Each structure stands twice: as structure tokens, then as C-alpha cells.
């Protein structure tokens, strides 16, 4: 104990740098026994001398004896105090810029211990610039070193925007992504995924991760045995999916996500459906690729299995919406839904107790399926037309009670705007009217007045679909009569000069049929 | 938005009616293709959904001399054939 400690304390402080060498070495050997390290801890003078010399020396051997000394010091509650109250954290952060592996290991391990058991260490490391120093070290190769560094970032970034934005500004995203491409050590991959999940919550970090290629990199590990790694990757993947639907090199990720739809785990199904929904939203190539690997079949089975679970059906129906329009394989996808017995279940999602978002998505899917003539009669035989009229009527009559002459009080119900329901339902009935039997069913429900009303609507695309469905009806003589009787001549004429030239096309088409 | 870059075959026929760029949206391709057929007036007036393009470039770019406007999937297939998505 206090026998050689004062004299060793008085030798780390010495203007001769040789003297501080053999000092530091014998203080290192000293720090290895509980009796001899207790005392260094209880001596405030010894601790800052170690820290001060560690941080200022240029000789290497002393720099890792001191660093190793503090590392031996960090295994005790009261050794973490002494390091803390002696300004060790700023010193340890400085040594993260050292070009010697031995010192680097001691410095990052002591910091790791302080961050884990010493309160106030999170803040101190942040003030000293520890995050920037740690992100820079992520280009090292030693697997165990990376795991300690990434866990330290996990500790500092959890629920702290400043730390996440600093990691973002320091170039953390691509480094964490590159670790996921390169390594197979589970413990490092899991820790790295924990940091990426934390960063993916902050929407500012999403483009950086995506751009680095984190989608493809995290998808690499959805076959990994460790399930804590998989669901961390899946969670992060779902959080990240709305940003960038413009990514190439996604063939393997998309194929794996379709396979994961058949998972025994039900939250894996939910995440996989939500990711596929976002990845298919605007992307021509992702659509062709999901279909090519049997995505339509898997998503239809996902909907059947889901029942009334709207956390599953809503994303799965949305994914099926995207895949049945505006790509080369849309005509297949429309048929595949019917051939895998999807038409009945798609229609009852229209009825209660579905909420408006699922109903809106289902209406949009039905509109796409109606583009296939083989679906016209089966959709009719499933009762789709009267249910679409039910939703259209309820949504239109809801807009009316909010329209007056100051416009319409724009509002949302369960995240949806009723105008969207009017738009999709009349659009769905527009495509369904291409079949003669459907037209008989449509008019049979006294809908011609309802559609005539929608011509005066101030929404552009509602004029689109209202004029469009009245067109199809008019190509039957006995229809064409009933529409003139309601008073369609006047508004249709002013629609003939619409910025939406498609509106003028149907408008003239109706006028040709009525009075010839 | 889906941007496409038409094959030189189809690019003549677009610029045949005053197209500008080398990439378009499907809306523009469908507009100019539509404008073309109405300028050439390739459609039969008895049933104006039939389009004979016997010795017109359209038949040369599509294949066959006489489709109908309402055979939608056959037309889009021929359209896709002359396109490269971006």
C-alpha cells in the first residue's frame, strides 16, 4: 500500500521521460493485485498522474502500461470514480486516436466499463467527442474490438437525438452497414443491428443507411440462426422501408421477404408484409421481382391466414395493390389473385369490421383486379358492386354534410379522407362497368343520380371517374336516356375544357350517346 | 414516377408527332402514340376502336396489321416490348 505509491506518484511527474518509463511499468505490475490496486484507487494523486502521463507521453510502452493500469482500475465501482473524477474520460477519448492496437484496446475497454457502470459517463464521453472518435475506429478489422466499439455506441445513442445526429454526421451509418456486409460473428452483428435499429427510428438517419446499402446488407442475415439478430434486422428493415424505393440489387432481399411470409412467427409475417408493401409502392423493378418469386401467391395466403388482423391484411393488401398495376406482370398478378382463391376474401375485407385504411387499400386492389376481364364476373358474383356502392354512398354523403359554400371542411377519419373513398370506389365501378352485366347491376342500384352529383364535385380525379363511369353506362341506349333525365347535359359541357383532358374525353362521349 | 426510354423504333414515331426528349412517362408515350393514330387517322370510322396499320410504321413497330384499341393487354405487351424502364 502507501509505501511506494507516493514515490511512484512522484516519478510519473518528472521532467526526465526515461524516469517516467520505468515508473509506469512497475505501477502496471503493481496494479494487478487487489491489495496493490486498492491503494492506487484510494490515492487521488496517483490516478491523475497515470491519466496525465498516459495522455501526454510519446513513448509507446508507458502509454499502454498506463492504459492497462486504468483498465485494471475499471473493474471496480470505486476505480470508476477515481478515473471519472480525475478527468480520465477526456484522456481515454484522446487515446482513441492512437496508432497502437494495444493502447486502443485498453482505452475502448475502459470507456466501455465507465459507460456501463458509471453514471455521468454518457454525458462526459459525448462532451469529449467520444462518438466521433468511436465512429472513426469502425474501419478496424479485429472482430472483438468492433463489438466493444458498437456496444459503446448503442449505450450512448439510445434515446438521445444529439448522439444519433453526431453518429450520422460522423459517417456512422455506412460503417455500421459495412460491418453487416463483412462479418459473420453473431455478437458483433447483433450489437451493430441494435445501433442501426436505434438510428433507423430517427427519420433523419434513414437516407444515410439506405444509401450505404443497409437494406441489402441487413437482408443478408434474415436466414441467421440467432433470432434476436433476425427480428432486429426485420424491425430496422421495416423502419427503413419508406425511405428509398429506388434501390437496386434487391433481388435476394425481396425473395427472402416473400419466403418469410410463411413464417410460424406472426410478427415476422407482419414485418415482412409491411416491408414488401413499401418496397413495391413506386418501384417497377421490385414489382416484377416480387411476382417472379411467387409474391402474389404468398401475399394471398398471408391475407387468408390473417383473418381480422388488420396489422397484417392492411400491408398485405397494399402490397397486392402495387403488384397488380403498372408493370409488365400486372396482368398475371390480377389473374393469380383469383386463381389462388383471393377474390372472396378480398371482397369481405370491404365489410365490417374493417377500418377505413384497410377499406381504402382493398378498394384500390379491387379496382386493379377489375382490369382483368376474367375477374369481372367473379367480382360481381362475390357481391362487390353493391358493397362498393355502399361505401361510395356513405363517403359522398359524408363529404356533403361538410361542404357548404366555404368549400368542404377537409377532415380525416381513421387516417383517411372520405374523398379518397369516393375516388377509389367510383374508379373501381368505372373499371367494372366495362362488362355489360355489371352495368345492369350498377344502374339497378339507382346510382346514375349519385354519379351525376359527383360531376359538380371540385376534386379533379372525382370528375375523372364520375364522367368515366357515366360514359360506360351510356353505351347502352336505355341507360343513356336515364342520365339525360337527371340533368347531366349542363355540367358535362363545361367539363369539355378541363386541364384534365381525360375528363373532356368521357364528357363528350356521354353527350354523343344521349341525344345523338 | 416510372420513366421509360423508348427504343429507336418507337422514338421515331413519338418524334413523328413532335416529341422532344429520349425518356418519358407512360402517360406521354400513351398520349403521343394516341395522337399519332388520330393524325394518320388509322382508325376505322365505322367502329373507331379498330386500328389498321397495314403499311404504316406502327405495324412495322408493333407486329400484325390491325389491332383493336380495346384488347388492352395485347397493346401494352407490344408497348413494353419497345421500352426500357428507368
Amino acid at each position: 500500500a502507501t509505501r511506494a505509491i507516493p514515490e511512484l506518484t512522484k516519478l510519473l511527474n518528472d521532467e526526465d521521460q526515461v524516469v517516467v518509463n520505468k515508473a509506469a511499468v512497475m505501477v502496471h505490475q503493481l496494479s494487478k493485485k487487489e491489495a496493490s490496486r486498492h491503494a492506487i484507487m484510494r490515492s487521488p494523486q496517483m490516478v491523475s498522474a497515470i491519466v496525465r502521463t498516459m495522455q501526454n507521453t510519446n513513448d509507446v510502452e508507458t502509454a499502454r502500461c498506463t492504459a492497462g493500469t486504468l483498465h485494471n482500475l475499471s473493474h471496480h465501482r470505486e476505480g470508476l470514480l477515481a478515473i471519472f473524477k480525475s478527468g480520465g474520460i477526456p484522456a481515454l477519448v484522446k487515446m482513441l486516436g492512437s496508432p497502437v492496437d494495444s493502447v486502443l484496446f485498453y482505452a475502448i475497454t475502459t470507456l466501455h466499463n465507465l459507460l456501463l457502470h458509471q453514471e455521468g459517463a454518457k454525458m462526459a464521453v459525448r462532451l469529449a467527442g467520444g462518438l466521433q472518435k468511436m465512429v472513426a475506429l469502425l474501419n478496424k478489422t479485429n472482430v472483438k474490438f468492433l463489438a466493444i466499439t458498437t456496444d459503446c455506441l448503442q449505450i450512448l445513442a439510445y434515446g438521445n437525438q444529439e448522439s444519433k445526429l453526431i453518429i450520422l454526421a460522423s459517417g456512422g451509418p455506412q460503417a455500421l452497414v459495412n460491418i453487416m456486409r463483412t462479418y459473420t460473428y453473431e455478437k458483433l452483428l447483433w450489437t451493430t443491428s441494435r445501433v442501426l435499429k436505434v438510428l433507423s427510428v430517427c427519420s433523419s438517419n434513414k437516407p444515410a443507411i439506405v444509401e450505404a446499402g443497409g437494406m441489402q446488407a441487413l437482408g443478408l442475415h434474415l436466414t441467421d440462426p440467432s433470432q434476436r439478430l433476425v427480428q432486429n434486422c426485420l424491425w430496422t428493415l421495416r423502419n427503413l422501408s419508406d425511405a428509398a424505393t429506388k434501390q437496386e440489387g434487391m433481388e435476394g432481399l425481396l425473395g427472402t421477404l416473400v419466403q418469410l411470409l410463411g413464417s410460424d412467427d406472426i410478427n415476422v409475417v407482419t414485418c415482412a408484409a409491411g416491408i414488401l408493401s413499401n418496397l413495391t409502392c413506386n418501384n417497377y423493378k421490385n414489382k416484377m421481382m416480387v411476382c417472379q418469386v411467387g409474391g402474389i401467391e404468398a401475399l394471398v395466403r398471408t391475407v387468408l391466414r390473417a383473418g381480422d388482423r388488420e396489422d397484417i391484411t392492411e400491408p398485405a393488401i397494399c402490397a397486392l395493390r402495387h403488384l397488380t398495376s403498372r408493370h409488365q406482370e400486372a396482368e398475371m398478378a390480377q389473374n393469380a389473385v383469383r386463381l389462388h382463391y383471393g377474390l372472396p376474401v378480398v371482397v369481405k375485407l370491404l365489410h365490417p369490421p374493417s377500418h377505413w385504411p384497410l377499406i381504402k387499400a382493398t378498394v384500390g386492389l379491387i379496382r386493379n383486379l377489375a382490369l382483368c376481364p376474367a375477374n369481372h364476373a367473379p367480382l360481381r358474383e362475390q357481391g362487390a358492386i353493391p358493397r362498393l356502392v355502399q361505401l361510395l354512398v356513405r363517403a359522398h354523403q359524408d363529404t356533403q354534410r361538410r361542404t357548404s359554400m366555404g368549400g368542404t371542411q377537409q377532415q380525416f377519419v381513421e387516417g383517411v379522407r372520405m374523398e379518397e373513398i369516393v375516388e377509389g370506389c367510383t374508379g373501381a365501378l368505372h373499371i367494372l362497368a366495362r362488362d355489360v352485366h355489371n352495368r345492369i347491376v350498377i344502374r339497378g342500384l339507382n346510382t346514375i343520380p349519385l354519379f351525376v352529383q359527383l360531376l359538380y364535385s371540385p376534386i379533379e380525379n372525382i370528375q375523372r371517374v364520375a364522367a368515366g363511369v357515366l360514359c360506360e353506362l351510356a353505351q347502352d341506349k336505355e341507360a343513356a336516356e336515364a342520365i339525360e333525365a337527371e340533368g347531366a347535359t349542363a355540367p358535362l359541357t363545361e367539363l369539355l375544357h378541363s386541364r384534365n383532358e381525360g375528363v373532356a374525353t368521357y364528357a363528350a362521349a356521354v353527350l354523343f350517346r344521349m341525344s345523338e | 414516377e416510372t420513366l421509360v426510354r423508348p427504343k429507336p423504333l418507337l422514338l421515331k414515331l413519338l418524334k413523328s408527332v413532335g416529341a422532344q426528349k429520349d425518356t418519358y412517362t407512360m402517360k406521354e408515350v400513351l398520349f403521343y402514340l394516341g395522337q399519332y393514330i388520330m393524325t394518320k387517322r388509322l382508325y376505322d370510322e365505322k367502329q373507331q376502336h379498330i386500328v389498321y396499320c397495314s403499311n404504316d410504321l406502327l405495324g412495322d413497330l408493333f407486329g400484325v396489321p390491325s389491332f383493336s384499341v380495346k384488347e388492352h393487354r395485347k397493346i401494352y405487351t407490344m408497348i413494353y416490348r419497345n421500352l426500357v424502364v428507368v
Partner: peptide, 16 residues
């Protein structure tokens, strides 16, 4: 020519 443009507009509606 209205009959033809209306048929062409049914065509183009599949890309909406």
C-alpha cells in the same frame, strides 16, 4: 372522333 378517343382513354386508364 369522340368514340375513338374514349376508347383510347379506357386504354390509358390502366396506367392510373
Amino acid at each position: 372522333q369522340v368514340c375513338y378517343q374514349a376508347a383510347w382513354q379506357c386504354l390509358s386508364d390502366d396506367w392510373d
